[PDB]
Structures are given as C-alpha cells and as structure tokens.
C-alpha cells in the first residue's frame, strides 16, 4: 500500500507518525512554525499537518484570507527546506488549490469536501485525500452525538463519501479514511469505534486516526490536556496494533519509539495484523 | 470471571493489573516507595531481596529473610495491596507466606531443592517463569515448558487454580525471540491461566530504540499496551502511573470490543 503525491510517494507497510502543526494564533509565526516542523522531523515524523482552522469543538470559523495567509507560507517553507510529507488541515477550495502548488502532499479535510468547491478543488490537484466522519459540524457537534449504531454509521458514511468522491473523478487508490475520534462522539462512542477499528480494513484503504490529547482520554482519566501523554501512545499503540497507517499526534518522538515496538511486533506476527 | 485468593482476599483479574517493582531506615524508604507506587494505581507490589537480574549477587537464606520478611511484613500490616515476592529459596517462600505475602513469584519455578513443597504448603498462588540464546520455535519450547511445569506443581499437590504463567522476557532470550513471544502472547490462553509479562525498562526495549535505560517509559507503555490488547493480566513496571493509565485506556477499548481480547 502506497500513496504518491508531488513527484515522490510515501510506504504504508510500515505506521508513519504525522506530528501536528497547529498555525492558528492564540492571544514570527512562521518562523516558529518551521523550527517546531524541524523538531517534528528530527524526532521521526514523516508527515506534517499543518491546520490554520481550529476544528475543536466550539471553534469559530475562519476567512479565507486569514487561512491562507497562516497556512500557505508555512506549506511552501517546509516543502522548499524538508524532504519531509505534508498534509493540509482545510476545508476551502483555495486553501487546497494553492496548497497544492506551493508543494502539499495531502488534503486532510474533516469536512470529507463538503464545502462548495472543495470536491472540484481536490480532484483538480491529483493528491491524496483524507476523508473523515463528523457528525454535525465543529460548532455544535459533541453537544449531543447520538447513534444508534456508531460503527454501522460511519461505515456507512466511509461507503457514501468514497462513492461521492469516485464520481467527482478522484480514485479509490487516492483516498484515507479517519473515523474522526471526538468529532460528534461521546466516551462510548470514541471506545467504540477505537475498539471495532481494524474492520474498517475492508475498503483496503489506508486508515489514519487522530486521538492525541483528546478527551476521549481525558474524560476516561480525569486529567488535564498536559496529562495525557500515556493515554495517549496507548490509543496510539491500539490503533498501530490493528493496522492503522497514519497516526496524527502533537507527542512525536514518544509515539515514534512506541510505533517501532509495534513494529516489532508486527513483523514477528503471521498475519501482520491484530483483531 | 478469572480471579486469586490469598490471605483472605481476593484479585479480580476480570481486567489488567499493575505490579509495581520494589528493590530491597531502608525498611522506611521501602514502606515510602510502597506507598507512592499505591498511589500511583498498583495493586500488587512486587518485592525482591535478592535481585533477580542475570548475573546479580547471590545471597544466603539468612540474609535474603533479613531483607525480604520485614518489608513483606511492614506492608502487610500497614497497607491493603498484594505482595508478590521474588525468591527461589524455601526458607523465604515459607517465611513470606507467614507474614501475609499473597503471590510466590519464583523466577526459578520452584526448581530449587525445598522450593516446591514449601510452595505447596502455603497454599499461596505461584508464578511459573520460563527462563534459560536459541531456539527453533521459541514459542512452543516455552509452551512445552509450562505444560511440563504445570503438571510437576499439580503433582506436588498445587492446583491449576493456583498458577500464573510468565514467558520471561529478556531471561536467555534475544530481541528476536522476545518479539515473537510477545507477538504471540494471546495463544497462551489455551491453558486458562492468569499471564504476567515483565518488559519494562528491558534491553528487549533499550536495544530497539537504542537509548539508556532511564528513556525507555514509552516503549515500555508499548510493550504493556500490547500485552495487555492480547488479554495479558498482571503487567510487573517500574513507571506505575504511566502503565495504569495506558491499561485504563486497554481496559475502555476492550469492554467496547465483542471478543475481551485481540489475537
Ligand atoms: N484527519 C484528522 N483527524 C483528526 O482526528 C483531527 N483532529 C483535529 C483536532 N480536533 C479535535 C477534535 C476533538 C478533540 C477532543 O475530543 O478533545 C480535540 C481536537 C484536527 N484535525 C484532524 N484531522
Ligand atoms: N515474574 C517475573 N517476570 C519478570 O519478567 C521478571 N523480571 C525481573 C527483572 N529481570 C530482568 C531480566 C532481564 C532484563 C533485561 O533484559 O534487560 C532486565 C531485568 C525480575 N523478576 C521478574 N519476575
């Protein structure tokens, strides 16, 4: 399983840590940006995430103005200095469109291109596309998730958006699917799905998966957001164990040494896989 | 549904436990570290007088009772937690058994001369290790090992009931062969019997990440993360928060999951 995107590819028989790069300011950012994406590096990230909308439950929306100026220079900076993969944490054509050209490797969109436009915008640049499940929006999402089914609803879910995009023109082969741990979900719901992750490998599309710091820990703990590091590789070292292939965290060289034991593991294993 | 009983208490091993690692006015420090490890979560302390690491000091009978029994002792009497101690010796198999040790947690499976009577007499649970690197199929020789210690403890009159099984990372075993075991640890099950796997801070861990000793926390919450996926039931640490935290997060994951078990 491999993706391939801007002239070079990236190989998923191995899990590959992708270190958060958060670029909205809170009350030189792209200096700062960079020498905390070179940190990422050097502790073993091999993709980079760089978001310029806070997506955290409550978030206030950004312009596209605003999103561009934080985010674009910072793509452009580390694609010209690093060797290193890109994604880029957006939802606006634009912001996928000049990504893009400035050397972007992925579109992760937590919206799965439901913004007008974005469909077009991210069949028009060819590259990887991360689709994952939100029910609601960042706004009011978690203030009352509801399902029936969690794992049917998403699945579900994962079926229509991989359809929506194939008839937008993107292939299958271009596709990751997230099943956005704390975007409309209560505790139950996150443990559910972390749980259950491993049959989501029936589409034979790589999974990435995002639970760092979240509260799906730290409502489980009763710990603060700076207290979370051990809660957090063991979600980590659950979803590598099932064959997850992207793991999106803020803790890289931590999550980087536990991918290595699972790794080890891995590779000791018949099947490869843990169900 | 899987449990232990000593001492007129029982461990409910229905979900993971930490074993908190204690090394033998050094009987206050050890009641201090006892204490702390308590805090941090630990609900069995595992204490050893004298090391258990390859190549470590031998000690005499009189001076491993010397080091060991008061500590075994002081806890008993002063906190609510399982003991769980490291000897090899009848003398202080016996001995920690009188002064309210809850598990026998011999390295040596009771091969020393004495130690599997006195084993027997306490009625208390025991803890069989495989120890020894080579090996063509490293998990069936450790296999074959417990089905061969199994039926040598219930000859001497120790029921299964009694038993827990450990594969013995790190003990004449390569980086290699500890990966396969613990790759494959869920098979064990086929026995029904408590697992207790000790990772922590081993070479298993220093060698793959190439760092010292003190930097293995995360490879080590790994190490016990995988474990305990595959069902594993009592995790022997060092960093006692940390592992508890990560078996909460185990603990979450399989109540959600229809098979309590990843294999
Ligand atoms: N692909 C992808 N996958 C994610 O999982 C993700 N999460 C965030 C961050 N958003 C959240 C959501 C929930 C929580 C909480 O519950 O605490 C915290 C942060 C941003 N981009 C993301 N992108
Ligand atoms: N039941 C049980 N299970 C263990 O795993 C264990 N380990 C030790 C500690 N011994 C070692 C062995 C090897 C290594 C290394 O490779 O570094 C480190 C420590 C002591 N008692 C133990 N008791």
């Known amino acids: 399983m491999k993706l391939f995107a801007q002239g070079t590819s990236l190989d998923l028989s191995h899990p590959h840590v992708m270190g958060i790069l958060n670029v909205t300011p809170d009350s030189n950012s792209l200096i700062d940006a960079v020498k905390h994406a070179n940190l990422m590096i050097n502790a073993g990230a091999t993709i980079i995430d760089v978001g310029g909308e806070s997506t955290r439950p409550g978030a206030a929306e950004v312009s596209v103005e605003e999103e561009l100026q934080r985010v674009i220079p910072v793509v452009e900076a580390i694609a010209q200095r690093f060797e290193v993969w890109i994604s880029v944490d957006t939802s606006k054509p634009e912001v996928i469109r000049e ?141 590598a164990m099932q064959g997850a292939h992207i793991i999106r965290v803020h803790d890289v060289k931590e999550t980087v040494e536990a991918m290595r034991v699972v790794e080890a593991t891995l590779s000791a294993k018949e099947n490869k896989r843990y169900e």
């Open 99 to 239: 990504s893009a050209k400035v050397g972007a490797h992925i579109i992760n969109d937590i919206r799965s291109l439901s913004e007008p436009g974005a469909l077009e915008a991210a069949a028009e640049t060819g590259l990887p596309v991360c689709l994952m499940h939100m029910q609601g929006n960042p706004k009011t999402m978690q203030e009352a998730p509801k399902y029936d089914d969690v794992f049917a609803e998403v699945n579900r879910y994962f079926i229509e958006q991989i359809a929506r995009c194939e008839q937008a023109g993107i292939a299958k082969e271009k596709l990751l699917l997230d099943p956005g741990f704390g975007f409309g979900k209560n505790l139950s719901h996150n443990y559910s799905l972390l749980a259950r992750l491993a049959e989501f490998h029936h589409f034979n599309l790589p999974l990435l998966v995002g639970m760092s710091r979240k509260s799906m820990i730290g409502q489980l703990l009763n710990v603060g957001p700076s207290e979370r590091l051990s809660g957090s590789l063991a979600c980590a070292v659950i979803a």
